[PDB]
Nucleic acid binder design. Structure first.
Ligand code: A1CHB
Ligand code: ZN
Lengths: 459, 746, 766
DNA sequence: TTTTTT
């Protein structure tokens, strides 16, 4: 009963900030007019698109996986006007489960549904047109124009199709696990907000209110990836991207316009870590602290051979994480052992799609022989998966298979943090004792945030 | 019709040891007498003896030895070029051999005595001494001497020493060298040996680069010292006329060698060269090349000596250092030679009696005693101390204390018990060795040379006969009982001691001194008389009348362990500390610090509650520790000062492979190994044998964080004893060396 | 005119209601006035007390004046009988989300829905779980239910309504005290929490500590303020049994009364130097007066004529192999007289031991064998030279041409005097002065003095590694350095209490090298002190580091630029670790002085020509007629955080054995390690069949010996991973349940595996 | 290497 106390009394300053952030009237001229979105439809290519500022606010809620940010979202929903959304369908259902466990929450959908994402947008060329930012210092208008040119094949279609949605009744948009969304989406959401409040001439648009994006997510346990498929080489590539959280934390233009210093809440405590040591490991991992000999000796007690994890006879009921989809396709098989379209497209190509033909996760992680979790609205074993997909959902028992050379300490931290107890955790090698490419750039940014008087830390 | 002369025998050496024909269990031994008549003129003489197998096994203590073994050893020793250093195989064999030949010389021929008048006869038909008799006419010539210095660089290969030390670990390095010469006698043929014998008539000096080669520098001649004598003899063993060459020592009598850097290999090599040179020409018999010393045994020995069992027939006395009183120790060595017939300290405990006749004398002495002491002997267990003493954590004062000692009680008691078992001896004439011990005891107070003999003859005799310890400690137990009984009558109170030495207190008022002397003297008189009466009643009669020594009067006395006692007389500030180990040069400074701290801490008798005194005492003890460790820093580079004398019995640090390269320095190591713990590099502490490296030494900084810890350990033992003995107990004085003053060295 | 707010769910069933009357006083209502008014409103016998009734992000109308209507309203409000359509018309989720208890089901439903927003206050912004928690601590006496009906025996609304209406948490004192108790509890809680967060935010903002210290601090402080016991006692204090506010059983809370007594008591310890020294450093000094002071000086400091200008060098300078061989050759002339045989760390240890060895009288010192001169006087400096392309060339010198090395940065007395006349200042003057600024060949290009633990340290040499967000102006840096001088001198006068450090005349020396502002700060150890020990200078460095991030001037000046506030590195003081000397480069930046003149320096030219003297920047330099000398040889050992020590104390008090003690269970080096090797042999065959028959016949040999890390090399070792030279090792530490963490580790001398780095392969239980 | 939106 005392567990809730800190959250109960520390979410109130958060609540007493989002209110003024949402009740701040804009000047008449700064409000995006309807004619703006009319001209956007007329524009064919995202080059002559005029530099247009779309005002918005943010409030950042950050912390470990089991930090308790969900309590903050719970308190927000029952007190404030809000449209609760999620970056993934799983995260949206998780929030619904945790919001209907206290009071009534309307069906929580994804942010993609909220701004009108439909079927044909799923496979759309989302990275085509270029942009030489007339920047340094980067004006907010230039950043928004970059994020609209990035999503031209989505923004243009949404604008054309538009030219009752839940964005017409609130200006506080809570995006949970927003680190799973790329930076292109942030501007997009704001842009779309103004759309749906301009065609309908909402009372908020008459009151000159502006969107406030309460982004709740873990900045060092979540990443966003962009996939582009080259249509001649047939080489589908996936590069890393800047998530909304990293975009907001690490961009000097957004950190000033949104004033992240007075608009940042870090939830700091785990509530399932009964191991001083498991907790200390997670702390060294989510903050970028120097790796010492003692940490190496602690994680030494988890290392079990390569042929012990991969052998299906060992660790029954333990989810096994690999860092390659081919590796999972091998392990699952081992465990089991224990015309017009392609005419015209061939014409147009001047001359791997099995993954790009359905839900990628199970499509590239399947041997279809089964022995489970529903993937779409397409079943997954939940017995073996990739580290990258593991970010989404927590696991009970975990055995991690690490490929040497490809060792990224963020991947190690994500893999090791999916389980509550360090007792039920086995690993291939020691990520702390092997060569690992650590990227501690967002870590120092949180550290400087933990070192700012205007940032609210909730224990 | 036997010839008769007047001479004094200066030495007795062994020439030949042969097995005559039709003989199986008795061997004849020829003895060379270096006789000198009046005014020093010397004529060489010879005698023959006949030792039986039984006598050999008696003087050996075991039947393992046989006549064949002795004759084989003598035959091997006949030639020094082929094989010198013969005794090193079985030192006990040659020890017993000299013992029995001297005993048979005493028995058959008669009473012999070095440096003393003696009427000597001879039979021309055979040509040997026939009978020796003590004479009573003549101011015999003074035992002249000659100063000998000899140094040789015997190029012994270090690896052989390392291997031989590996076979037997705690082998004194002089034994390692000596075994190396024995296994390779050619090494004694090449050495830069230099010799300088100075006499009162003419000096003689020679220098060699290779020993066999002619000298590279001469002085005087061999003939100035020696008068080579060819004497014909007809022993009962040899029917044919046998000629013997001997090196009559004209001008001098015995040798005097400095024991500071004495090298037994050096004199062995020089005498081997002389043996080869003199007996090179044939047509004559060859003598025995035998020498004994502490360097001839694996574990070494306490007292330096160099026995001359054969060639050249001249005793050589090593007098170690003692430059201030060099004449005193030279006279002591001469007296020890003359009295015990030169067997001491080579023969051992057999000077008195055969090692195996003792089991009879001890039994024969357990019978003539009184009935009570008869059982008291039989119930003696090591360190019984059946007498009312003080608890070892205790202290006394201010009361009139006094220490007493019976000078030479174990030796005197051994002499009396030997006489009690004398009737039980097989031969009344075989009791002459029992006349040397009485001569030692009688002359012990008069001259200290008998002392050091008796402090080693007695403990070694007690090891020859284990049954004698239970007899001596039972007689001393009886003495302590009457000491305690008489003590009560004269206000004396037994509080501690170790038998012959005992300290106690007096129940007189602790302020009056005029009458203190009277009671302290009457207690001495009464205790001495009562102990003498008990000894007389026990039939044991002492040759020198018993005397008690007042070894000091003190007012405060504090004891912590069984041997640790500190006494202090406040009036004259005379103190005495015992039980503190003097295991080096730093332990003496520690003892001085302790004897000053205790003098200051028992000066705190100012009226105070006992609790206050404990703290103002512990503070001063900690301050004394501080002033000791501060002065330790100013001598951190004196490795010899931070040195510990390890015995060949105690666990020792392992010898570095470079200490086997000391050359003419490994020979000095006979008993003690002086080790200093230095700290090379870091963490590791390694031991350096200090006296096996040339000087000046170069070393890593001395690990004072090891020696000072042990010195401090014993200081805290003494300080915990005094703290828990004068004031209330419960305080173990510990000095935080590791924290307060560790930084100075580590 | 009594107004009722009623929640219903279908004849109408009313199950929660809030009755109120408009306050006729302007500001008359008090807490007890409100309590009396409410207790009058809710009739204890049952129902209300009025004659006419108007019954009506927000969480959620009929008149009643005729006798029949009011009678029906009382009947339906005190018992729960449904209101028929005529009376009005003429005028599991709930049991789930509003607690299982009757107290919750009545009182929390009344407050969170029909009472929170109307009455305003802080409770309007609190969630349902928070309000239920407040109700749980509203522990008024509980009388038994007359019908003994359980709260879970309710199926329809006719049961919940009957439970609530005939409850005794609904028509009297409890129904009147709950709204006031919500306000009281929140007020008491926020009073304590807000105070604790004021302290938290302030200390966080002004901490200026290393990144790792900060994490422990936030977590531990949050635990003290918010912890199971502290929060429990705080809520127990606010707990009220009497609803009446005058005699409420809630008193001040123990939380905010124990933290300000335990950790926040010492949150102001790291917050102020004077308290950081008192509670975090344990000084251990030993005074040595007389000839022993002179003795300790020469014995533990570089010889007098070793850091004094000489025309040419004299020493042993050579590469690793050439000095390894020369060290052995010197030992061949050193072994004959005592030095034991030593059959890049061994070379540095041996060179340091040779340099430390002192002169015994007029005899040439031990290092004279290597340096080859009789004028050599020990102790001596030992340097490390990095060459191109590589090669650590160690160089032990007895004298060197330091006049030549510092000649470039030596300013003539005339120049400094002329600048002093032009600029009579200390900040703008140092500005002008700074603006006016083969192993044998590499000696004068790169040197790194190597710490010798045998000798005594006389200068506080701190390596300031500053990280930068962007390029900085020099003036800001010089002002920050003045602030650093101030803070360091305060810390020095705190650490050495019997000294006299006037922080306007005591000379501190500064040297500066897109990445970092390389700084080196040299301070004379004030007389009569001398510091001994690597750990002692580690502690001095921690005190200085946590003292400079206390002066507001330094953090205000350089704070906007330093990404990580950690400035001082404390790992360059271990035995055998080198520090780059000033007036030297790196093989990219020649450390050159930056002059921060003392504010009241009485000799400026001396201060400038004091940076060129090597003694000012050497660890074990000769101290510049000593009566007394105080050796600070300990400032406390392992400096467990002044916080994590409390996190070490709280570690067990909340969570719950060393390696040696755990070994006692196994009756405990090579003996038991070979037994564990037997278990390893059985599993290595299955886990790694390619080298199954290799470690079956190997011998354990302890290579690394640590308190919690016993590493034993398996000397017979082909690498199990990346099968192709490799060394196998047996680790020993603490297991999951305080067991034995025995690990198989295959360090590999190949490029594929991290070269010479220790790796783990499997950890098995014992 | 690398998921996800209908
Ligand atoms: C004794 C003690 N106990 C403490 N508690 C309750 C915890 O450490 C709890 C906990 C455990 C894991 C995480 C954690 C989880 C992540 F996923 C990432 C990062 C994280 F830190 C956070 C909190 S804190 C202390 S102290 C040392 N501060 O005195
Ligand atoms: Zn390898």
């Amino acid at each position: 009963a005392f567990l809730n106390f800190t959250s109960m009394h520390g979410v109130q300053p958060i609540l007493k900030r989002i209110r003024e952030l949402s009740q701040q009237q804009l000047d008449g001229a700064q409000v995006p007019h309807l004619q703006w979105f009319r001209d956007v439809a007329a524009l064919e290519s995202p080059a002559g698109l005029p530099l247009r500022e779309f005002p918005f606010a943010v409030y950042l809620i950050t912390g470990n996986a089991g930090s308790g940010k969900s309590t903050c979202v719970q308190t927000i929903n029952e007190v404030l006007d809000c449209v609760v959304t999620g970056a993934t369908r799983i995260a949206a259902q998780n929030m619904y489960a945790k919001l209907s466990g206290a009071f009534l929450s309307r069906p929580i959908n994804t942010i993609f549904h909220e701004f009108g994402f439909r079927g044909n947008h799923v496979q759309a060329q989302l990275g085509q047109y270029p942009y030489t930012l007339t920047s340094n210092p980067a004006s907010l208008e230039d950043l928004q124009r970059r994020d609209l040119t990035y999503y031209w094949e989505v923004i243009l279609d949404l604008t054309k199709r538009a030219l009752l949605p839940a964005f017409t009744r609130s200006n506080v948009i809570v995006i949970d696990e927003a680190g799973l969304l790329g930076r292109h989406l942030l501007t997009a959401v704001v842009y779309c907000w103004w759309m749906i409040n301009a065609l309908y001439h909402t009372p908020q648009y008459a009151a000159r209110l502006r969107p406030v994006l309460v982004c709740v997510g873990s900045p060092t346990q979540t990443a966003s990836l962009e996939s582009t498929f080259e249509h001649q080489k047939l080489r589908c590539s996936v590069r890393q991207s800047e998530n909304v959280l990293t975009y907001l934390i690490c961009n000097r233009t957004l950190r000033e316009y949104a004033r992240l210093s007075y608009s940042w809440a870090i939830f700091i405590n785990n509530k399932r870590c009964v191991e001083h040591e498991f907790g200390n490991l997670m702390k060294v991992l989510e903050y970028g602290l120097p790796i010492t000999e003692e940490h190496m000796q602690f994680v030494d007690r988890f290392v079990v051979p390569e042929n012990y994890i991969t052998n299906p006879a060992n660790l029954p009921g333990w989810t096994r994480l690999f860092s390659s989809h081919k590796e999972v396709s091998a392990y699952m098989a081992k465990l089991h052992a224990y015309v017009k379209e392609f005419d015209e497209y061939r014409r147009l190509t001047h001359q791997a799609n099995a993954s790009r033909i359905t839900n990628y996760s199970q499509s590239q992680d399947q041997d279809v022989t089964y022995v489970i979790a529903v993937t779409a609205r397409g079943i997954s074993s939940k017995l073996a998966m990739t580290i990258t997909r593991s970010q989404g959902l927590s696991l009970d028992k975990v055995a991690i298979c690490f490929t040497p050379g490809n060792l990224r300490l963020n991947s190690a931290y994500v893999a090791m943090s999916r389980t509550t107890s360090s007792e039920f955790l086995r690993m291939n090698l020691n990520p702390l004792r092997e060569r690992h490419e650590r990227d501690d750039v967002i870590s120092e940014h949180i550290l400087s945030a933990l070192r700012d008087p205007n940032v609210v830390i909730v224990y | 019709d036997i010839v008769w002369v007047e001479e004094s025998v200066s030495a007795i050496t062994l020439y030949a040891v042969w097995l005559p024909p039709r003989a199986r269990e008795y061997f004849h031994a020829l003895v060379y007498f270096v006789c000198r008549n009046a005014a020093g003129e010397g004529r060489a003489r010879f005698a023959e003896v006949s030792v039986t197998a039984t006598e050999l096994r008696d003087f050996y203590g075991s039947a393992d030895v046989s006549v064949q073994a002795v004759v084989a050893a003598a035959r091997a020793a006949t030639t020094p070029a082929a094989s010198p250093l013969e005794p090193l195989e079985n030192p006990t064999l040659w020890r017993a051999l000299y013992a029995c030949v001297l005993a048979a010389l005493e028995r058959q021929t008669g009473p012999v005595a070095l440096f003393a008048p003696l009427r000597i006869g001879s039979d021309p038909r055979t040509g040997l001494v026939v009978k020796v008799e003590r004479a009573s006419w003549g101011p015999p010539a003074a035992p002249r001497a000659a100063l000998l210095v000899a140094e040789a660089n015997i190029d012994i290969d270090p690896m052989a020493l390392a291997a031989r030390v590996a076979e037997h670990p705690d082998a004194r390095l002089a034994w390692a060298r000596l075994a190396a010469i024995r296994d390779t006698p050619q090494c004694a043929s090449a050495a830069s040996l230099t010799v300088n014998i100075t006499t009162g008539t003419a000096l003689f000096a020679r220098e060699y680069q290779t020993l066999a080669f002619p000298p590279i520098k001469k002085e005087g001649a061999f003939g100035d010292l020696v008068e080579v004598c060819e004497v014909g003899l007809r022993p009962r063993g040899h029917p044919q006329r046998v000629t013997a060459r001997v090196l009559l020592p004209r001008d001098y009598d015995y040798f005097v060698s400095a024991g500071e850097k004495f090298s037994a290999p050096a004199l062995v090599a020089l005498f081997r060269q002389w043996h080869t040179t003199v007996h090179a020409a044939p047509g004559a018999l060859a003598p025995v090349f035998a020498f004994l010393g502490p360097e001839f045994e694996v574990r070494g020995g306490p007292v330096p000596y160099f026995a001359v069992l054969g060639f050249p027939g001249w005793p050589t006395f090593t007098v170690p250092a003692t430059a201030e009183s060099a004449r005193d120790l030279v006279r002591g060595a001469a007296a020890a030679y003359a009295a015990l017939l030169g067997a001491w300290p080579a023969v051992g405990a057999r000077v008195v009696l055969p090692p195996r006749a003792w089991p009879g004398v001890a039994s024969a002495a357990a019978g003539c005693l009184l009935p009570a002491v008869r059982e008291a002997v039989a119930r003696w267990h090591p360190a019984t101390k059946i007498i009312q003493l003080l608890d070892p954590p205790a202290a006394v004062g201010p009361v009139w204390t006094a220490r007493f000692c019976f000078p030479g009680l174990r030796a005197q008691l051994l002499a009396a018990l030997a006489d009690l078992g004398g009737s039980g001896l097989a031969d009344p004439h075989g009791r002459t060795g029992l006349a040397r011990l009485d001569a030692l005891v009688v002359a012990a107070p008069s001259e200290p040379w008998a002392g050091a003999v008796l402090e080693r003859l007695v403990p070694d005799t007690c090891n020859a006969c284990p049954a004698l310890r239970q007899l001596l400690g039972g007689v001393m137990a009886a003495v302590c009982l009457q000491i305690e009984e008489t003590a009560s009558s004269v206000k004396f109170a037994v509080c501690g001691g170790d038998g012959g030495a005992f300290w106690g207190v007096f129940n007189v008022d602790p302020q009056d001194a005029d009458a203190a002397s009277g009671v302290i003297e009457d207690a001495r008189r009464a205790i001495e008389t009562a102990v003498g009466a008990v000894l007389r009643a026990n039939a044991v009669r002492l040759r020198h009348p018993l005397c008690l020594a007042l070894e000091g009067v003190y007012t405060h006395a504090v004891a912590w362990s069984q041997a640790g006692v500190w006494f202090w007389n406040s009036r004259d500030n005379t103190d005495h500390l015992g039980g503190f180990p003097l295991r080096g040069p730093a332990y003496t400074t520690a003892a001085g610090v302790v004897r000053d701290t205790l003098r200051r801490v028992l000066g705190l008798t100012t009226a105070c509650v006992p609790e206050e005194d404990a703290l103002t005492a512990r503070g001063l003890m900690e301050d004394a520790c501080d002033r000791l460790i501060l002065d330790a820093f100013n001598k951190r580079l004196d490795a010899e000062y931070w040195s510990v004398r390890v015995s060949p019995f105690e666990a020792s640090d392992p010898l570095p492979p470079t200490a086997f390269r000391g050359g003419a320095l490994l020979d000095a190591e006979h008993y003690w190994r002086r080790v200093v713990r230095v700290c090379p590099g870091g963490g590791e502490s390694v031991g350096v044998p200090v006296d096996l490296y040339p000087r000046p030494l170069v070393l890593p900084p001395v690990d004072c964080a090891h020696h000072l810890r042990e010195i401090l350990r014993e200081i805290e033992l003494v300080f915990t004893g005094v703290l828990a003995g004068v004031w209330g107990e419960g305080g173990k004085f510990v000095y935080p060396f590791d924290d307060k003053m560790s930084f100075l060295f580590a | 005119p009594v107004e009722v707010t009623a929640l219903y769910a279908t004849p109408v069933y009313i199950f929660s209601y809030d009755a109120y009357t408009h306050d006729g006083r302007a500001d008359g209502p008090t807490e007890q006035d409100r309590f009396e008014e409410s207790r009058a409103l809710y009739q204890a016998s049952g129902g209300l007390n009025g004659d006419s009734f108007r019954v009506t992000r927000g969480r959620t109308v009929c008149r009643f004046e005729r006798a029949d209507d009011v009678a029906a309203l009382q009947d339906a409000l005190a018992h729960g009988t449904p209101l028929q359509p005529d009376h009005i018309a003429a005028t599991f989720w709930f049991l789930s989300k509003f607690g299982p208890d009757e107290k919750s089901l009545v009182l929390t439903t009344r407050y969170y829905l029909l009472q929170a927003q109307r009455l305003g206050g802080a409770g309007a912004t609190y969630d349902l779980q928070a309000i239920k928690d407040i109700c749980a601590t509203y522990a008024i006496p509980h009388a038994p239910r007359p019908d003994t009906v359980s709260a879970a025996s309710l199926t329809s609304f006719a049961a919940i309504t009957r439970f609530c209406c005939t409850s005794q948490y609904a028509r009297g004192a409890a129904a009147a005290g709950f709204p006031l108790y919500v306000e009281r509890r929140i007020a008491a809680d926020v009073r304590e929490t807000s105070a604790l967060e004021k302290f938290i935010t302030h200390d966080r903002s002004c901490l200026r500590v290393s990144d790792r210290e900060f994490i422990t601090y936030i977590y531990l402080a949050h635990f003290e303020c918010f912890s199971p016991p502290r929060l429990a006692t705080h809520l127990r204090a606010v707990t009220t049994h009497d609803p009446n506010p005058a005699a409420s059983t809630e008193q001040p809370s123990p939380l905010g009364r124990e933290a300000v007594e335990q950790f926040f008591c010492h949150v102001r310890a790291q917050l102020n130097i004077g308290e950081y020294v008192k509670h975090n450093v344990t000084p251990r000094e030993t005074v040595l007066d007389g000839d022993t002071a002179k003795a300790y000086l020469r014995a533990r400091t570089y010889a007098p004529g070793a850091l004094t200008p000489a025309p040419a060098y004299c020493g042993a300078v050579d590469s690793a192999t050439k000095m390894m061989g020369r060290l052995a050759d010197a030992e061949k002339l050193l072994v004959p007289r005592g030095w034991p045989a030593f059959a890049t760390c061994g070379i540095v240890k041996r060179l340091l031991r040779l340099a430390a060895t002192e002169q015994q009288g007029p005899t040439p010192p031990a290092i004279a064998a290597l340096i080859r001169n009789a004028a050599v006087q020990t102790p001596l400096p030992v340097y490390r030279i990095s060459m191109v392309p590589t090669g650590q060339a160690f160089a032990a010198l007895a004298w060197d041409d330091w006049a030549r090395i510092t000649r470039d940065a030596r300013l003539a007395e005339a120049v400094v005097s002329a600048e002093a006349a032009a600029h009579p200042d200390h900040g703008a003057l140092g500005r002008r002065l700074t603006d006016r600024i083969d192993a044998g060949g590499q000696m004068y290009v790169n040197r790194n003095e190597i710490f010798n633990g045998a000798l005594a340290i006389t200068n506080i040499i701190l390596d300031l590694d500053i990280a930068l967000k962007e390029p900085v102006p020099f003036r800001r840096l010089h002002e920050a350095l003045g602030h650093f001088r101030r803070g360091a001198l305060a810390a020095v006068q705190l650490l050495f209490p019997a000294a006299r450090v006037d922080p306007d005349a005591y000379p501190c020396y500064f040297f500066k090298s897109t990445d970092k502002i390389g700084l080196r700060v040299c301070m004379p150890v004030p007389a009569p002190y001398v510091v001994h020990g690597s750990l002692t200078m580690r502690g001095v460095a921690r005190v200085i580091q946590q003292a400079v991030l206390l002066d507001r001037d330094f953090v205000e000046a350089i704070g906007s630029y330093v990404k990580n506030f950690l400035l001082i590195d404390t790992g360059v003081y271990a035995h055998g670790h080198s520090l780059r000397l000033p007036y030297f480069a790196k093989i990219c930046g020649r450390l050159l002085p930056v002059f921060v003149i003392p504010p009241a320096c009485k000799d400026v030219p001396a201060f400038v020509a004091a940076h060129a003297d090597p003694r000012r920047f050497h660890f074990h330099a000769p101290p510049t007629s000593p009566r007394e000398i105080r050796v600070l040889h300990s400032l406390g050992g392992d400096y467990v955080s002044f916080f994590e020590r409390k996190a070490s104390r709280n570690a067990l008090e909340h969570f719950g054995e060393t390696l040696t003690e755990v070994l006692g269970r196994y009756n405990v080096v090579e003996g038991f390690a070979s037994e564990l090797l037997g278990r390893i042999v059985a599993c290595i065959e299955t886990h790694f069949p390619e080298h199954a028959g290799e470690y079956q016949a190997v011998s354990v040999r302890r290579a690394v010996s640590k308190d919690d890390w016993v590493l034993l090399q398996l000397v017979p070792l082909s690498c199990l991973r990346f099968k192709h030279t490799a060394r196998t090792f047996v680790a020993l530490s603490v297991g999951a349940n305080n067991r034995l963490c025995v690990s198989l580790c295959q360090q590999c001398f190949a490029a594929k595996c991290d070269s010479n780095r220790l790796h783990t392969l499997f950890t098995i239980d014992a």
